[PDB]
Amino acid sequence: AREITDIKQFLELTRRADVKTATVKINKKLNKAGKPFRQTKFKVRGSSSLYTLVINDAGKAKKLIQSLPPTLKVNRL
Amino acid sequence: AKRTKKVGITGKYGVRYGSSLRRQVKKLEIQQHARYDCSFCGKKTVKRGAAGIWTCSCCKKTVAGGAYTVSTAAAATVRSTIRRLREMVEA
Amino acid sequence: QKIAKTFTVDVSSPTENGVFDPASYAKYLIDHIKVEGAVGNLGNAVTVTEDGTVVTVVSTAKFSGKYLKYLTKKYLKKNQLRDWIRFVSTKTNEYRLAFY
Amino acid sequence: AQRVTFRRRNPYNTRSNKIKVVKTPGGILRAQHVKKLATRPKCGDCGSALQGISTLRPRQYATVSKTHKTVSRAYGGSRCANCVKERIIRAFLIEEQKIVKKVVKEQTEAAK
Amino acid sequence: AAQKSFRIKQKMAKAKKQNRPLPQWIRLRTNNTIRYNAKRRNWRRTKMNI
RNA sequence: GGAAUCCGGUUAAGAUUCCGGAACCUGGAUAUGGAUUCUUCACGGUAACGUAACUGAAUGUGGAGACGUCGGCGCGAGCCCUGGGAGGAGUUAUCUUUUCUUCUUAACAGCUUAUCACCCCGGAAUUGGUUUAUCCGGAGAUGGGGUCUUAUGGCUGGAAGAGGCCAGCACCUUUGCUGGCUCCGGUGCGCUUGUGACGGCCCGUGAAAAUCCACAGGAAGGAAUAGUUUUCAUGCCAGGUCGUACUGAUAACCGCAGCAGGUCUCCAAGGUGAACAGCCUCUAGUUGAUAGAAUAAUGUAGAUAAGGGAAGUCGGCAAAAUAGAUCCGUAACUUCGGGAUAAGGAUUGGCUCUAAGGGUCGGGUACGAUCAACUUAGAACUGGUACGGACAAGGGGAAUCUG
Incomplete structure (x- = not known):
């Protein structure tokens, strides 16, 4: 119930030792006039709040899932 | 225009109550609903709030007074009596 | 502002079952589409083509998918093809006629 | 034109029983109780x-x-x-x- | 009533269990003269008065 | 009065209580980070004041809790009305780009958002600003620039994965599986409701306490070879007891009863119409009340009557007549407010036109484009002179006794 806007602040969140799980939600949207694009939502579940990171650039999305820790129970869609 | 001839504010009572009783009400309801000069800021803002209570809008000072006018005829001469009696003490 | 819309009809399924023809159906859209409220004022702003099995309107005037369904349900009522032929959208603005 | 109910067992229109009608994600109207200002x-x-x-x-x-x-x-x-x-x-x-x-x-x- | 105290809900709990006929094996007992439940209550024939 | 919970789903019957997701509060321990510190207990702003924090006991002060009623105005929410588009259903002798319907976004959280109020610059008569309502200004207006309250709204997260509407395949099955679309607007003396700034009224000025916070005070504890802080962030634990089904009434209550009686309250669609009136419909809910056949008298309820019009009768009892709106015209008397809808007259449909009443945009230091309203007045035509066509809806006057 809280958006995280800094991508490096999102990465320090995943190693906060209560975040056991996360999810990657993909939404088909349009880029404000025409063609569709792929937005992805990186939701980590903390012990008292859910943090969300929206990523519009689908290339930068690919460099982020490899940046996730190997222990996180990532639930794709 | 001039809406009523003589009833004035008391035309809200209509035809009731007896004309001499609506004349004595009109003498005082003009006085209690009028704005008076503030003694303190010199503005005409003092309106009654309740019987004997007279509050000023700006400078917000609330002065106690008569029930329908700010200064009654009795208490004005009282204030000048005690004014006279006090200067017989300092002299 | 000027941009063209395309409303395609799939009349395949009843023409392989004999009840239906697309040529008179393609004719029926021409002499019944109202452009500014009058029939016959089509004039290249709305064209009706017919690919033998795919009827397609290319529209710049006001012409809705609600109006293509209305003119088709009006057509099947004239030719008694209701209770056999339904009008079904399979995608956005790509339509289809159902047999049985 | 979807009529609504109270959600608690106070059926009277008191100061502690105010209602704002809100649309839920179920597409229905439901009353929600608003605290005093x-x-x-x-x-x-x-x-x-x-x-x-x-x-x-x-x-x-x-x-x-x-x-x-x-x-x-x-x-x-x-x-x-x-x-x-x-x-x-x-x-x-x-x-x-x-x-x-x-x-x-x-x-x-x-x-x- | 529909929002009760426990002392009122306790007295309906007892009077619910007394809302039954005789056990039918009672009538077969030796010298049993009880023919039927003569204290049976019904909600629309006699109010409990709490 | 009051610490704090919402959405979606599930049952034969429970749900703000269960399930999935997502929050918040209270009490409690507590660890790490951020902050503060060599000027020990933070800095910035002229100021209103700002913020991720930024010690503060006794005692004192203050605020919140904490408050009437009515009127009009502004704003918001929901509903209603309406346009395009994307689906579905109905009508189709003829007509109808048509009729109906789905198009939704909770609590909570981050950013932003306002009337009022306040601050700085400036110093106003040729008085200016301004409300629907006339109040404000040298005790500092108009103006330029700002600060705050966050009711409220917008965006994002919650959240599309949910809910909705559809389509295509499957099948004695638990019943599936897979796709789409879920979009952008407009309007208002509309209805309900909350709210704000006001105004009217009172010999009526329209509760209290728990509880919470702040301020003042500076007791006291405090770092430099290292402390201070847990009103900042995250972390951990727990939150007992009792009620929770159903009716709420022309069958669940009280009336000896499954009695035409009585019994407190919330929500509240469309048309006509001033209207929460009557009359008709949508959602939802009923179709319950012993029936069948005949149509005597007399009833009960509803009506209509030629000519006369109270002659009936204790008495115009009962019924009839009148009635809405617009325009005209209104008497005696009066406590001058009234009487008064006095009395008494005229008009009223449908259709086709005319005229007047508005919003927003660009003018360097006279106008035009465009958009959106129902109100009022008038003209022509028309009809078995009808038109508040049903519904709804004053009879009036001249006096006497009396309060």
Whole structure:
């Protein structure tokens, strides 16, 4: 119930030792006039709040899932 | 225009109550609903709030007074009596 | 502002079952589409083509998918093809006629 | 035209039983109970609402930090920067007049 | 009533269990003269008066 | 009065209580980070004041809790009305780009958002600003620039994965599986409601306490070879007891009863119409009340009557007549407010036109584009002179006794 806007602040969140799980939600949207694009939502579940990171650039999305820790129970869609 | 001839504010009572009783009400309801000069800021803002209570809008000072006018005829001469009696003490 | 819309009809399924023809159906859209409220004022702003099995309107005037369904349900009522032929959208603005 | 009910067992339209009708993600109307509105804090001298102070119901002032309930001055969330201002004028001039009132009697005891 | 105290809900709990006929094996007992439940209550024939 | 919970789903019957997701509060321990510190207990702003924090006991002060009623105005929410588009259903002798319907976004959280109020610059008569309502200004207006309250709204997270509407395949099955679309507007003396700034009224000025916070005060504890802080962030634990089904009434209550009686309250669609009136419909809910056949008298309820019009009768009892709106015209008397809808007259449909009443945009230091309203007045035509066509809806006057 809280958006995280800094991508490096999102990465320090995943190693906060209560975040056991996360999810990657993909939404088909349009880029404000025409063609569709792929937005992805990186939701980590903390012990008292859910943090969300929206990523519009689908290339930068690919460099982020490899940046996730190997222990996180990532639930794709 | 001039809406009523003589009833004035008391035309809200209509035809009731007896004309001499609506004349004595009109003498005082003009006085209690009028704005008076503030003694303190010199503005005409003092309106009654309740019987004997007279509050000023700006400078917000609330002065106690008569029930329908700010200064009654009795208490004005009282204030000048005690004014006279006090200067017989300092002299 | 000027941009063209395309409303395609799939009349395949009843023409392989004999009840239906697309040529008179393609004719029926021409002499019944109202452009500014009058029939016959089509004039290249709305064209009706017919690919033998795919009827397609290319529209710049006001012409809705609600109006293509209305003119088709009006057509099947004239030719008694209701209770056999339904009008079904399979995608956005790509339509289809159902047999049985 | 979707009529609505109360959600608690108080069926009367009291002060503690206000209703705002809201649309849920189920596409239906449902009433939600709204708490009574917070008043602003008022100044201890002039009575006006004093600015910079958040307006919460009184027990919600224990959940918020110090900077929601204060301004940065003497008499922060108690007086209103103009009653504080006249307080400094009045404290200075009377206590300076008391310095005058000391020595103006020290000439009368020196000349009687 | 529909929002009760426990002392009222306790007295309906007892009077619910007394809302039954005789056990039918009672009538077969030696020298049993009880023919039927003569204290049976119904909600629309006699109110409990709490 | 009051600490704090919402959405979606599930049952034969429970749900703000269960399930999935997502929050918040209280009490409690507590660890790490951020902050503060060599000027020990933070800095910035002229100021209103700002913030991720930024020690503060005794005692004192203050605020919140904490408050009438009515009127009009502004704003919001929901509903209603309406346009395009994307689906579905109905009508189709003829007509109808048509009729109906789905198009939704909770609590909570981050950013932003306002009337009022306040601050700075400036110093106003040729008085200016301004409300629907006339109040404000040298005790500092108009103006330029700002600060705050966050009711409220917008965006994002919650959240599309949910809910909705559809389509295509499957099948004795638990019942599936897979796709789409879920979009952008407009309007208002509309209805309900909340709210704000006001105004009227009172010989009526329209509760209290728990509880919470702030301020003042400076007791006291405090770092430099290292402390201070847990009103900042995250972390951990727990939150007992009792009620929770159903009716709420022409069958669940009280009336000896499954009695035309009585019994407190919330929500509240469309048309006509001033209207929460009557009359008709949508959603939802009923179709319950012993029936069948005949149509005597007399009833009860509803009506109509030629000519006369109270002759009936204790008495115009009962019924009839009148009635809405617009325009005209209104008497005696009066406590001058009234009487008064006095009395008494005229008009009223449908259709086709005319005229007047508005919003927003660009003018360097006279106008035009465009958009959106129902109100009022008039003209022509028309009809078995009808038109408040049903519904709804004053009879009036001249006096006497009396309060």
